[PDB]
Amino acid sequence: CDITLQEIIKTLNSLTEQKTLCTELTVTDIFAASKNTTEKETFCRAATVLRQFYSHHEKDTRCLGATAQQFHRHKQLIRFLKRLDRNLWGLAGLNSCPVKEANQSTLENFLERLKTIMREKYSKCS
Amino acid sequence: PFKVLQEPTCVSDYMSISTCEWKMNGPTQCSTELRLLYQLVFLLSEAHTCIPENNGGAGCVCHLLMDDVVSADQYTLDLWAGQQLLWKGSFKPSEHVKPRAPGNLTVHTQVSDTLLLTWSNPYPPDNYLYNHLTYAVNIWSENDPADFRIYQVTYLEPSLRIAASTLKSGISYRARVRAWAQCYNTTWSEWSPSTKWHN
Amino acid sequence: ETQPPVTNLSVSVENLCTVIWTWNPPEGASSNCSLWYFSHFGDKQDKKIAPETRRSIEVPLNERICLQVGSQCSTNESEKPSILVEKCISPPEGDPESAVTELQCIWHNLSYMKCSWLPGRNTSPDTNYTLYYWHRSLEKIHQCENIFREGQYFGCSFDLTKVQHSVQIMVKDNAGKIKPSFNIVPLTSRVKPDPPHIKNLSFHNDDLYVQWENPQNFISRCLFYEVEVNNSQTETHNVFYVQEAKCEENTSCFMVPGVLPDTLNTVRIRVKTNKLCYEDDKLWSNWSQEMSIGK
Ligand SMILES: *[C@@H]1O[C@H](CO)[C@@H](O)[C@H](O)[C@H]1NC(C)=O
Ligand SMILES: *[C@@H]1O[C@H](CO)[C@@H](O)[C@H](O)[C@H]1NC(C)=O
């Protein structure tokens, strides 16, 4: 376990402390519907999943209006999501991960689910 | 006729500017003769151009502008002259980190026979480095180069407090500091701007 | 373009506050429809889409909660049925004024849980409180038996060890007159470790070395530390915030810069869980016992 672990955990901890409005939207609950899958797939799927989100909502006025603070608070969200994507992705080392598109649940929920899992890994490794 | 001498080298400040340096065979006008092309080894990411700057009559340097970088990032480097591809390589920032030298080093005189030196962490609180920076203060005497001292700081507060008892009154002292992050196996930063004071 | 609503939505509670919704498929819906149900709390607050005809959650029952359930043929932004059936569950009979306040808990040293509270604004001077707790591991709801009284506080404590997790907490009366009080404890949070033990203090050229043994039940990697250093002569109370305390089993090391062996330094060390392994990091352990160096 290298620094990537810490960077991920750090970003999640930053994402989960600041509740946005774009966080209401949903994504695939790869976690709650967990299978015989291995770690690599998981981080990967998360990367794939997270990609979809900002890949769509980076240009989404619905999340962007209100105040110029929230405008940036959204910028942050997209920024941190992007950073989270690349890390998980590289941590997986897989060319593609076919996401089955099964259940949906809020991104907030998703981020919390993941936050927990990463935390576990960080403490059990050596 | 163009030919690179020593293979380009890059360090990252893990914030934005990951500078790169190299030397050609003869004196080149870096700013007009060559171009530096970097790109993120990730899907959907385009290439980037850079106008190199002169670093010694033959030596060139470009500062790779990078919005935000993570541990996983792998970069493509290509050095162009015009249309003749001279050399190309890859570079993973997180691997080779040169922390941004700290600044605003100031000396203070508290009572109780203690000397307080305070500097500021060059990084913002959301930088992946902010929390791993361990500084190394360096206090020395002007005409006594043997009268040098180096104090390690591991705690988060960017402040060291030595005792006056370790300082000769009526004598000039200088202090400079440098930070580094052990978790990233970085190299030392530059020293901070020196400071002078007498007892 | 719109499927029919769900049928006979009911709601029951299991454990202490695991609210479980249940329903049936619509009537005479599209045959060419792959059947998915959409649900969220009042104010479309925390949404979710799944094939299951049920959705359960672990939520305190101090306030009332409603789930709205709808119908769908895809997982996307479809013509959503636009007919949301819904059912609520209301808090237990007792009046709000009688329920206890300030119900709090702390998982001490990953060994036991200590919870306390104060009586409600309008509580009979005779009411007896009982505290109940439940989590995945337990056979059935457990009753907390080691009670205590401190100042005006009432409280109980129970053994809770280690090998997502959260404990369900409820405190009510033995006469069923007052309003029950609920509490879900994150359990990756609210952890106060025991204080560390300073092994030794070595001076080496004015560089002070501090070795201490962290509390038995914790990993160094998961703790953050704060080192206090008081000086009798210079009267200089200092305290250092340290996150990485590594040496060159169980022990951790930190070095105090710029101190001299010709002055007494008193050292203490307290510890807290970090956000890298834990949900929150607010609850500092107590201070360790002191160890001084040499005047
Ligand atoms: C001290 O220097 C830093 C750059 O290292 C700068 O960002 C900061 O504004 C300076 N201090 C203040 C608060 O004036
Ligand atoms: C840190 O990097 C240097 C690069 O020269 C290497 O020699 C050293 O082994 C590294 N330290 C470790 C063991 O992480």
Burial of C210 (0-12, 13-18, 19+ CB in 10 A): buried
Give the resolution in Å.
Answer: 3.0
Q: Using the atom order of ligand 1, give the atom closest to the CA of residue B122.
A: 5
**Residue for token pair 């990967």:** A44
Domain that holds residue C291: 195-295
Chain A residues whose CB is inside 8 A of the C221 CB are 122-123
The CA distance from B186 to the nearest CA of chain A, in Å, is 13
SS3 B99: coil
CB-count burial class (<10 Å; 0-12, 13-18, 19+) for B63:
middle
Provide the 10 A C-beta neighbour count for residue A76: 14
Q: What whole-number distance in Å separates Cα of residue B121 and Cα of residue B110? A: 22
Instruction: Work out how many domains chain C is built from and give that number.
Output: 3
Helix (H, G, I), strand (E, B), or coil: what is residue A110? helix
Determine the 3-state secondary structure of C71 from DSSP: strand
The closest CB to that of C254, out of B114, B131, B154, belongs to: B154
Q: DSSP secondary-structure letter at C38?
A: E
Angstrom distance (rounded) from CA B114 to CA C294: 19
- C243 and C199, same structural domain? yes
Ligand 1 contact, B122 CB (< 6 A): yes
Q: Is residue C273 classed as helix, strand or coil in its secondary structure?
A: strand
The dihedral of CA C11, C14, C19, C23: what is its sign? negative
Q: What is the DSSP letter of B192?
A: P
Q: Are residues C9 and C60 in the same domain?
A: yes
B40 contacts B87 by C-beta, under 8 angstroms? no
Q: What are the φ/ψ torsions at residue C203 (nearest 5 degrees)?
A: -85, 135
Distance from CA of A1 to the nearest CA of B (A): 12
Residue of B114, B155, B182 with shortest CB distance to C240:
B155
Judged by a CB distance cut-off of 8 A, whether residue B165 touches chain C is yes
State the Cα–Cα distance between residues C15 and C130, nearest whole angstrom: 16
Contacts for C192 with CB less than 8 Å, ≥ 6 apart: C106, C107, C108, C109, C283, C284, C285
- Residue of chain B with shortest Cα separation from C242: B155
Tokens matching residue C121: 């604004």
* Phi/psi of residue B35, nearest 5 degrees: -130, 145
Boundary (domain end) residue, out of C143, C159, C194:
C194
Handedness of CA C207, C208, C211, C212 (dihedral sign): negative
Q: CATH number of the domain at C237, please.
A: 2.60.40.10
DSSP 8-state secondary structure symbol assigned to residue B97 = B
CB pairs < 8 Å spanning A and B: 35
Tokens encoding C56: 């359960």
Parallel, antiparallel or unpaired: strands C18-24 and B148-153: unpaired
Strand, coil or helix: A81: helix
Token duo for residue C46? 């925390």
- Considering the domain architecture, whether residues C111 and C179 belong to the same structural domain is answered as yes
Q: What residues pair up with B63 in beta bridges, in sequence order?
A: B19
HSE-CB of C118 using CA atoms within 13 angstroms:
7
Nearest atom of ligand 1 to the alpha carbon of B100: 5
Could you tell me if C199 and C291 lie in one domain? yes
Q: B183 in contact with A at a CB cutoff of 8 Å?
A: yes
Residue of B105, B118, B133, B158 lying closest to B14 (CA atoms): B133
Final residue before a domain boundary, out of C93, C119, C144 = C93
Closest residue by Cα to residue A51 from A23, A86, A21, A17: A86
Residue from C168, C157, C171 nearest C112 by CA: C157
Q: Both ends of chain A: CA-CA distance in Å?
A: 7
Radius of gyration of chain B (CA): 21
Distance CA B158, CA B116 (A): 11
> If you measure from the C-alpha of residue B104 to the centroid of ligand 1, how many angstroms do you get, rounded to a whole number?
7
Q: Which ligand is nearest to the CA of B96?
A: 2
Tokens of C152: 């005006």
Q: Which two tokens stand for residue B130?
A: 């902010």
Residue type, B57: G
The number of residues making up chain B comes to 199
Do C218 and C230 lie in one domain? The reply is yes
Could you tell me what percentage of chain A is helix, strand and coil, using 3-state DSSP and rounding each to the nearest 5?
65, 5, 30
- What is the CB-side half-sphere exposure of residue C73 using CA atoms within 13 A? 14
- For ligand 1, whether the C-beta of B104 sits within 6 Å is yes
Nearest to B72 among A6, A14, A86 (CB): A86
**Which of C38, C80, C277 should we substitute to test contact with A (largest number of A Cβ atoms within 10 Å)?**
C277
Q: Could you tell me which of B82, C137, B128, B29 has the C-alpha nearest to residue A84?
A: B128
Domains with residue ranges and CATH for chain B:
1-97 (2.60.40.10), 98-199 (2.60.40.10)
C48, A6: Cβ pair inside 8 Å? no
Residue with tokens 């970090």: C274
Which residue type does B121 have?
N
Coil, strand or helix at B184: helix
Same domain, C287 and C199: yes
Burial class (CB within 10 angstroms; exposed 0-12, middle 13-18, buried 19+) of C242: buried
Contacts of A7 in chain B (CB under 8 A): 70-71, 128
DSSP string, C160-188: -------EEEEEEESSS-SPPEEEEE-SS
CATH 1.20.1250.10 fits A1-126, yes or no: yes
Ligand 1 touching residue B120 (CB < 6 A): yes
Q: Distance of CA C162 to CAs B192, C170, C212, C249, Å?
A: 48, 21, 24, 21
If asked whether residues C257 and C271 sit together in one domain, one would say yes
Contact in structure between A28 and A97 (CB atoms under 8 Å): no
With beta carbons less than 8 A apart as the criterion, state whether B97 and B11 touch. Answer: yes
Q: Does one domain contain both C177 and C104?
A: yes
CB contact under 8 A, B113 and C234: yes
Among residues C168, C194, C220, which one ends one of the domains?
A: C194
Using alpha carbons only, how large is chain C's radius of gyration in Å? 27
Q: How far is the CA of B71 from the centre of ligand 2 (A)?
A: 17
Residue A96 corresponds to which amino acid? S
Question: Three-class SS of residue C143?
Answer: strand
Of the ligands numbered here, which is closest to the C-alpha atom of B189? 1
Task: Give the Cα separation of B151 and B168 in Å (integer).
Answer: 18
Query: Quick one: which ligand is closest to A2's CA?
Result: 2
Angle among Cα B9, B35, A90 to the nearest 5 degrees reads 55
C-alpha span between A16 and B39 (Å, rounded): 31
Contact C280, C257 (CB under 8 A): no
Whose CA is closest to C62, among C15, C100, C26, C11?
C100
Q: Does C59 touch chain A (CB under 8 A)?
A: no
Using DSSP's 3-state secondary structure scheme, residue A24 falls into: helix
What HEC string does B72-89 produce? Answer: CCCEEEEEECCCCEEEEE
Type and span of the H or E element at A41: helix A39-57
Q: DSSP code of C44?
A: G
Q: For residue C78, give every residue at least 6 positions away whose Cβ sits within 8 Å of its Cβ, in sequence order, or none.
A: C72
Pick from C218, C28, C182: nearest CA to C104: C182
Q: How was this structure determined?
A: X-ray
